[PDB]
Design an enzyme around this catalytic site. Structure first.
Site, PDB file in Angstrom:
ATOM      1  N   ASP A   1       0.786  -1.234   0.000  1.00 29.33           N
ATOM      2  CA  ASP A   1       0.000   0.000   0.000  1.00 29.33           C
ATOM      3  C   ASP A   1       0.822   1.290   0.000  1.00 29.33           C
ATOM      4  OD1 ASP A   1      -3.170  -0.671   0.821  1.00 29.33           O
ATOM      5  OD2 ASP A   1      -1.722  -2.222   1.334  1.00 29.33           O
TER       6      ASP A   1
ATOM      7  N   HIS B   1       0.466   3.541  -2.324  1.00 32.71           N
ATOM      8  CA  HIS B   1      -0.470   4.557  -2.812  1.00 32.71           C
ATOM      9  C   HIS B   1       0.239   5.734  -3.497  1.00 32.71           C
ATOM     10  CE1 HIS B   1      -4.360   3.223  -0.898  1.00 32.71           C
ATOM     11  NE2 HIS B   1      -3.494   2.470  -0.249  1.00 32.71           N
TER      12      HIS B   1
ATOM     13  N   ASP C   1      -2.335  -2.010  -3.849  1.00 32.52           N
ATOM     14  CA  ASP C   1      -2.492  -0.555  -3.772  1.00 32.52           C
ATOM     15  C   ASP C   1      -1.187   0.226  -4.017  1.00 32.52           C
ATOM     16  OD1 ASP C   1      -5.300  -0.661  -3.554  1.00 32.52           O
ATOM     17  OD2 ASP C   1      -5.317  -0.328  -1.404  1.00 32.52           O
TER      18      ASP C   1
ATOM     19  N   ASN D   1      -7.475  -2.890  -4.444  1.00 25.87           N
ATOM     20  CA  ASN D   1      -8.657  -2.268  -5.033  1.00 25.87           C
ATOM     21  C   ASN D   1      -8.433  -0.860  -5.592  1.00 25.87           C
ATOM     22  OD1 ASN D   1      -8.339  -2.002  -2.188  1.00 25.87           O
ATOM     23  ND2 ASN D   1     -10.159  -0.671  -2.220  1.00 25.87           N
ATOM     24  N   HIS D   2      -7.368  -0.186  -5.179  1.00 26.13           N
ATOM     25  CA  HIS D   2      -7.102   1.145  -5.721  1.00 26.13           C
ATOM     26  C   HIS D   2      -6.454   1.042  -7.118  1.00 26.13           C
ATOM     27  CE1 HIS D   2      -7.859   4.666  -2.870  1.00 26.13           C
ATOM     28  NE2 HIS D   2      -8.463   3.637  -2.298  1.00 26.13           N
TER      29      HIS D   2
ATOM     30  N   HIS E   1      -4.835  -9.148  -0.555  1.00 24.02           N
ATOM     31  CA  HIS E   1      -5.283  -7.772  -0.393  1.00 24.02           C
ATOM     32  C   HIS E   1      -6.765  -7.749  -0.011  1.00 24.02           C
ATOM     33  CE1 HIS E   1      -4.482  -3.402  -1.097  1.00 24.02           C
ATOM     34  NE2 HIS E   1      -5.799  -3.385  -1.122  1.00 24.02           N
TER      35      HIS E   1
ATOM     36  N   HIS F   1      -3.523  -4.438   1.973  1.00 26.30           N
ATOM     37  CA  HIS F   1      -4.759  -3.681   2.184  1.00 26.30           C
ATOM     38  C   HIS F   1      -4.864  -2.957   3.550  1.00 26.30           C
ATOM     39  CE1 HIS F   1      -8.872  -2.342   1.857  1.00 26.30           C
ATOM     40  NE2 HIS F   1      -9.179  -3.028   2.943  1.00 26.30           N
TER      41      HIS F   1
ATOM     42  N   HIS G   1      -3.735  -0.878   6.447  1.00 25.57           N
ATOM     43  CA  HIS G   1      -2.684   0.148   6.466  1.00 25.57           C
ATOM     44  C   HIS G   1      -1.845   0.194   7.730  1.00 25.57           C
ATOM     45  CE1 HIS G   1      -3.848   3.122   3.017  1.00 25.57           C
ATOM     46  NE2 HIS G   1      -3.785   1.871   2.609  1.00 25.57           N
TER      47      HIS G   1
HETATM   48 MN   LIG Z   1      -4.620   0.804   0.599  1.00 27.10          MN
HETATM   49 MN   LIG Z   2      -6.838  -1.351  -0.288  1.00 28.49          MN
END
Ligand SMILES: [Mn+2]
Ligand SMILES: [Mn+2]
Ligand SMILES: [Mn+2]
Ligand SMILES: [Mn+2]
Lengths: 418, 402
Positions: free
Chosen positions: B28, B30, B68, B127-128, B212, B240, B242
């Site tokens: 993650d 991001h 992510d 999912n992102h 995830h 997933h 955080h």
């Molecule tokens: Mn995330």
């Molecule tokens: Mn996520």
């Protein structure tokens, strides 16, 4: 205006030119004096992406250009910009380009071009990166469609394209990339797209500086790549051929989509201008009809020879201009709808068999059962119905050829002369 | 029906068909998150670069990520640029990969004779990340990341391992990219998941599963119960989620270590985000495994404090006390900052002196119980007080009633 275009024709060599201080030249670890360059422009990757018939044209044709480059064993690839249609390309568009670049441009083939000089810790010239096996280096300027971060930078950062001819101001310094192959010397320049007027005014203000190699000063072949209007209706909204310094030997003119691959000799400036055109039709314009080509530019000493190559993956495009008041048996000023339609329908069929013929010509094949059939063609009829002529809804007309044309929505445009 | 989940075990089907592998683990990042923020606009690129930089510095065999990667489905040109740049500067080079594969543009990257991959990256999608081109596909096509563990249909999932060996040790690497929790849950309930195990040396393999998903939920169908995961696994990388729980936990019934390394950036002001971020290096040696936790140094500190005004002795109750609560809360924000700054110097292994880098603006949040007689400000007015001092313009304070 009329006289402003004459001020433009007479003015020449604007801005300032100043001076400045098998073999494998690639550093990947795991003839001989003729530089071979594939030239193309304006692939507009992504264009027509969402179209159920045309959606893959941009990707297939962009791939063709790189395929040819590899098949024909060229030393490098030079592009006139507008690589991508959208400023922020779809994931698909970016992917396909990167796929084509990766599969066609990397390999064990030695790059025989010695970088004498290009004048961040990303390796700038890609084949000089020891971690990337670059067979055929790609060089490109940015177009108006490629306008902090362009998708071009992305191609550059992956190591698959050399984004060059950067222009941050509108004092514009045009310095060269210097390449040697045997005794042949290529000085390579680019001005990425600038607003046509901003560029015209920079020349007038002599605010464009050209740097030339002092070494071998008279031995360099000088190539300039641009992405600008080659003509216009306003006299300050394009770039006058005469403005371009005459030390240049060759000019690659991107931005213009029409395929004028043969080149024009500018007798005053004494250089040849090649406008290779787009690899895809981005509008149903008269200029897009001319069959799309890419080229192979062979440069030896300060002599060059150009091979044109007909693109095999481009959808045939045929456009007809029709003036109804130049056609009988269409009796004007009477209910002549059935007569107008009949003529126009016969012209579409005509254009269609023209398109198929044009396609088979590009393939070097014949319509027989063992050969690939031509794709649905683009067909456009522009119809001046002045003088007393009945018309048909253009979409209704277009629907008379569903399954027979790529643009089954606007095959016909009716207008009156002005 | 939660009890039912704890009862269920080993769902879906199993079908058969130096000497230490060093893996940097994270999740993650991001990349792209907070892009437009004038203070925090560069956090995600800097921290994502940290992950790879460490890997390189600590000379690991490979990098494994739990999804992510990008905050946006269609990342900005900036985000994609920085990811690609970091990936290319950090993962390419002359170091041989000593990982033999036993399993063209969709192949394992370090095998490509045209790209010198020093440190291969493997990652599932979150999912992102999830049309059918993902940003993961883009990273894969450039040859910079090995996207794996794809989930083509949610209603029939075949999970197949990537097989890697170094000396005598054999790693079977499995991934299940993010699926809507409920969909995935059902797929386990109907035996619509299929786990492929290698015929040969069936038990020489250290089995590693990357996921995830929600590790917990408020309904019993919107998360992935640890129990469902086939007990042949030795390790589960839990993406997933955080919050950094880098020390991991041991499931005695399934017999596998779950490690939830947490994100490399905070994307909400949730309690889970306050735990200091780490990546890890999983040292696999045959059957056992040594996990080394590694504190991230580029992450902005985040300090959250819970306050009960009725318990604050320097504020008088059931009175016009507004002056006195602000003074306290302002001192609380000042106190959190100092905690943030110390936390940041601890990570750098430096002290606050003029020769040394000084700390970034921290994220600070106070949740305030003001039950009894107590006087609030507009939260926003309160957070405007800390422009020079805190990184978050909004949500510096939250008043609530018990
Ligand atoms: Mn995330
Ligand atoms: Mn996520
Ligand atoms: Mn164009
Ligand atoms: Mn253009």
């Amino acid at each position: 205006d009329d006289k402003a275009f004459e001020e433009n024709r007479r003015l020449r060599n604007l801005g300032s030119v100043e001076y400045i201080r098998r073999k494998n030249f690639k550093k990947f670890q795991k003839s001989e004096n003729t530089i071979r360059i594939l030239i193309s422009s304006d692939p507009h990757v992504g264009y027509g992406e969402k179209d159920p018939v045309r959606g893959n044209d941009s990707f297939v044709s962009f791939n063709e250009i790189l395929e040819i480059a590899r098949e024909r064993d060229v030393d490098m690839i030079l592009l006139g910009g507008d690589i991508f249609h959208d400023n922020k390309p779809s994931r698909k568009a970016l992917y396909q380009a990167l796929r084509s670049l990766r599969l066609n441009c990397l390999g064990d083939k030695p790059c025989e071009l010695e970088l004498l000089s290009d004048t961040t810790a990303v390796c700038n010239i890609n084949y000089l990166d020891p971690n990337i096996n670059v067979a055929i280096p790609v060089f490109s300027i940015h177009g108006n469609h490629d306008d902090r971060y362009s998708a071009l930078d992305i191609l550059q950062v992956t190591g698959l394209v050399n984004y060059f001819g950067r222009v941050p101001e509108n004092n514009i310094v045009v310095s060269p990339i210097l390449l040697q192959k045997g005794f042949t010397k290529l000085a390579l320049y680019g001005i990425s797209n600038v607003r046509d007027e901003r560029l015209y005014h920079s020349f007038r203000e002599n605010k464009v500086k050209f740097l030339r190699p002092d070494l071998y000063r008279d031995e360099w072949f000088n190539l300039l790549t641009v992405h600008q209007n080659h003509s216009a209706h306003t006299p300050t909204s394009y770039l006058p051929e005469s403005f371009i310094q005459d030390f240049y030997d060759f000019v690659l003119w991107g931005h213009e989509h029409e395929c004028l691959i043969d080149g024009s000799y500018n007798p005053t400036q004494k250089f040849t201008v090649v406008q290779p055109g787009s690899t895809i039709a981005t509008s149903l314009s008269p200029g897009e009809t001319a069959p799309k080509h890419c080229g192979i530019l062979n440069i030896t000493g300060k002599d060059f020879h150009l091979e044109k190559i007909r693109l095999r993956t481009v959808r045939p495009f045929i456009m007809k201009d029709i003036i109804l008041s130049e056609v009988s048996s269409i009796p004007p000023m009477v209910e002549n709808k059935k007569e107008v339609l009949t003529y126009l329908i016969s012209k579409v069929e005509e254009a269609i068999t023209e398109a198929n013929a044009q396609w088979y010509e590009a393939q070097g094949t014949v319509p027989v059962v063992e050969n690939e059939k031509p794709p649905l063609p683009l067909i456009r009829l522009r119809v001046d119905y002045t003088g007393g002529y009945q018309t048909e809804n253009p979409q209704r007309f277009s629907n008379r050829f569903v399954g027979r044309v790529a643009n089954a929505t606007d095959v016909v445009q009716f207008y009156l002369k002005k």
